[PDB]
């Protein structure tokens, strides 16, 4: 980001990044779509039971995920900066409450500032 | 590209001093306008937190969070003692030999 103080303001506000990374929704080999109509298509392929989930992605965005490989939920098909909502939904409360603290602690670690994770954790809880 | 050959004791010439004022300004200016925004940040923080008070002795949950040292790259940025000290264990830590206390 900027980053610094504005960065800290951005993290506590859960602001969507410029070019977000998207996250897989369930385990299973990934599947491709029809063609480039507007952006592109991407078909989720769950392995065993309910397998109707789907999403749409722009072909301008490069891809990183493997094609015929199994990919669990919360994996990076696309490199980029992550968003708190996505982490919370695809990983859980503890994963996101750890991401927030670990990321907001880097800007304070850069400057000689030391604060226990407890206060950031109470803020994340709120 | 044209560095400051002189040290403060020898004395600066006009050109190098003028070059230095460039970085001097951003430093002075950054402190003044940051004063306004830091207040906004801390104010929002106090606004989102006030009513939260320590109200109970114990919750009775083993959930907690897993505390592991921040070992980034080659070495550690902060040991585990510092990220664990002052807090309470969620479950019985065993000796590295499993099944102990």
């Amino acid at each position: 980001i900027t980053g610094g103080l504005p960065r800290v303001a951005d993290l506590f506000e859960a602001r969507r990044p410029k070019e977000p990374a998207i996250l897989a929704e369930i385990s299973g080999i990934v599947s491709f779509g029809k063609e480039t109509k507007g952006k592109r298509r991407l078909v989720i392929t769950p392995v065993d039971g309910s397998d109707p989930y789907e999403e749409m992605i722009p072909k301008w965005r490069q891809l990183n995920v493997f094609e015929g490989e199994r990919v669990e939920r919360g994996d990076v098909i696309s490199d980029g900066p992550e968003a708190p909502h996505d982490i919370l939904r695809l990983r859980g409360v503890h994963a996101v409450t750890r991401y927030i603290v670990n990321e907001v602690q880097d800007v304070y670690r850069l400057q000689g500032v030391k604060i226990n994770d407890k206060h950031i954790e109470v803020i994340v809880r709120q | 590209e044209t560095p400051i050959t002189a040290n403060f004791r020898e004395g600066l010439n006009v050109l190098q001093y003028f070059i230095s004022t460039h970085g001097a300004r951003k430093g002075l200016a950054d402190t003044a306008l940051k004063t306004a925004n830091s207040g906004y940040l801390t104010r929002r923080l106090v606004d989102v937190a006030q009513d939260l008070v320590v109200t109970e002795d114990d919750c009775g949950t083993h959930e907690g969070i897993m505390m592991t040292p921040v070992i980034e790259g080659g070495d550690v940025k902060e040991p585990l003692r510092d990220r664990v000290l002052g807090r309470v264990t969620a479950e019985d830590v065993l000796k590295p030999g499993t099944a102990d206390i």
Partner: peptide
């Protein structure tokens, strides 16, 4: 070493180089 920012040290510019 610490954003100053007048001169750089290793990764960023700094108040003291």
């Amino acid at each position: 070493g610490t954003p100053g920012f007048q001169t750089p040290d290793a990764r960023v510019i700094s108040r003291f180089g």
